[PDB]
């Protein structure tokens, strides 16, 4: 149940904020706007992705807001050509491990 329990969490928390643009540092200068909607991913596929991101389970587990930013990010950055050009790589690791300390203090 505990499981189920925690991928509802996660799937409710993005399903929330599905187009809400998000900042990432552009590989110019400068920030793009992205949102889980532009993954053109399902709702699943997202959902068991972030899984594997340090601290989202547990964050979930304690019913705790999600960084949907840094999550977003690590997804966007693993399997979406455009995100990965239009993103500084760089700074998006910094970027998303500032969102997890953040997160996970």
């Not at 793009?32 to 594997?52: A, G, H, P």
């Not at 690590?74 to 700074?91: C, D, M, W, Y």
């Given at each position: ?12 928390q993005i399903a929330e904020s599905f187009s809400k643009k998000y900042k990432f540092p ?80």
């Amino acid at each position: 149940a505990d499981d189920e329990s925690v991928e509802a969490e996660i799937a409710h928390q993005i399903a929330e904020s599905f187009s809400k643009k998000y900042k990432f540092p552009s590989r110019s200068s400068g920030i793009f706007l992205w949102n889980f909607e532009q993954l053109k991913m399902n709702l699943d596929e997202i959902v068991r992705e972030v899984k594997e991101i340090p601290g989202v389970i547990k964050m979930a587990k304690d019913g705790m807001k999600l960084p949907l930013r840094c999550m977003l990010g690590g997804v966007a950055s693993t399997h979406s050509r455009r995100f990965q050009i239009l993103v500084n790589p760089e700074k998006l690791g910094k970027v998303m491990q500032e969102d997890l300390d953040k997160y996970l203090t």
